[PDB]
Design a protein around this ligand. Structure first.
Ligand SMILES: COc1ccc2cccc(-n3cc(NC(N)=O)c(C(N)=O)n3)c2c1
Ligand SMILES: COc1ccc2cccc(-n3cc(NC(N)=O)c(C(N)=O)n3)c2c1
Length: 264
């Protein structure tokens, strides 16, 4: 069962501040060390979230951050996750910039691709795959997290394609135009994530506003090759950024292609 009783949790140390509240390091009774995220009331549709717990709890892969359960006795509710000792991938790339071998960056892309190929096979769409949503664990392993979360987010400025805070930088054209989500729109976000990894955590389209990204992408602009990305890696990146979702490789195809490059 996904319901965790407040007596089954102990908060040990404040890790930091998330978007919707606080993140703590804690222990889960008779189980493991955990990361506990406290969610501010009004931030998410708790009822819609709770409804999908039975089905969603079954998703498990070595490259996906495990969400152990939800503490919902009293407001604010808590989300109990697998503890990822090195934090988010975006901050990790940024602080370790200049210390990454090209093979390590490719391996990080491979970890995310494998996690996404599992979600794609399970018919689960992430919707907002980005380095900020990926976590770094034991021995630099990368795990995908927060998949499907934007379906519960109550801030219309983030969820609506015309929203002031819409994550347009990771959006495929059918997503930014019509909110037409698929594993193929996740493939486009994966390409941007590959660019983020190979650029050692640089922000994509830093010099552009939301409508400028939409105009550039619609007119054929694509993110420049990062210095650390080989031409073969950049070709894969461009394949993720094909205008038509049908022309984009599936995650199962990307995984074979990226593994062949890594293993030589
Ligand atoms: C457990 O309750 C839910 C309820 C709704 C969900 C909707 C989308 C995704 C969910 N979700 C998110 C997960 N992990 C994560 N790091 O974000 C998992 C999992 N099985 O590890 N399931 C959900 C998990
Ligand atoms: C939020 O601030 C921090 C600062 C330092 C951290 C050091 C280690 C791990 C962190 N951490 C742990 C997380 N979640 C998890 N499942 O383990 C997250 C996250 N962004 O979801 N960040 C950290 C989070």
């Amino acid at each position: 069962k996904w319901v965790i009783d407040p007596s089954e949790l102990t908060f040990v140390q404040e890790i930091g501040s998330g978007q919707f509240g606080l993140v703590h390091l804690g222990y889960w009774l008779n189980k493991d060390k955990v990361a506990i995220k406290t969610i501010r009331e009004g931030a998410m549709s708790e009822e819609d979230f709770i409804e999908e717990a039975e089905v969603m709890m079954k998703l498990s892969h070595p490259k996906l951050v495990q969400l152990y359960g939800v503490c919902l006795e009293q407001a604010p509710i808590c989300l109990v996750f697998e503890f990822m000792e090195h934090g988010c991938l975006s901050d990790y790339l940024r602080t370790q910039r200049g210390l990454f071998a090209a093979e390590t960056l490719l391996g990080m892309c491979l970890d995310v691709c494998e996690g996404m190929a599992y979600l794609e096979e399970a018919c689960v769409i992430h919707r907002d795959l980005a380095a900020r949503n990926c976590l770094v664990g034991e021995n630099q392993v990368i795990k995908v997290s927060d998949f499907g979360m934007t379906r519960f987010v109550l801030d219309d400025q983030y969820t609506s394609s015309t929203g002031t805070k819409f994550p347009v930088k990771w959006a495929s054209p059918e997503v930014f135009s019509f909110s037409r989500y698929s594993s193929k729109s996740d493939v486009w976000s994966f390409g941007v994530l590959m660019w983020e990894v190979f650029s050692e955590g640089k922000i994509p389209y830093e010099n552009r506003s939301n409508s400028e990204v939409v105009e550039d992408i619609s007119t054929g602009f694509r993110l420049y090759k990062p210095r650390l990305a080989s031409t073969h890696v950049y070709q894969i990146m461009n394949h993720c950024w094909r205008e038509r979702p049908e022309d984009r490789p599936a995650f199962s195809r990307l995984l074979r292609q990226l593994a062949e490059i890594a293993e030589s």
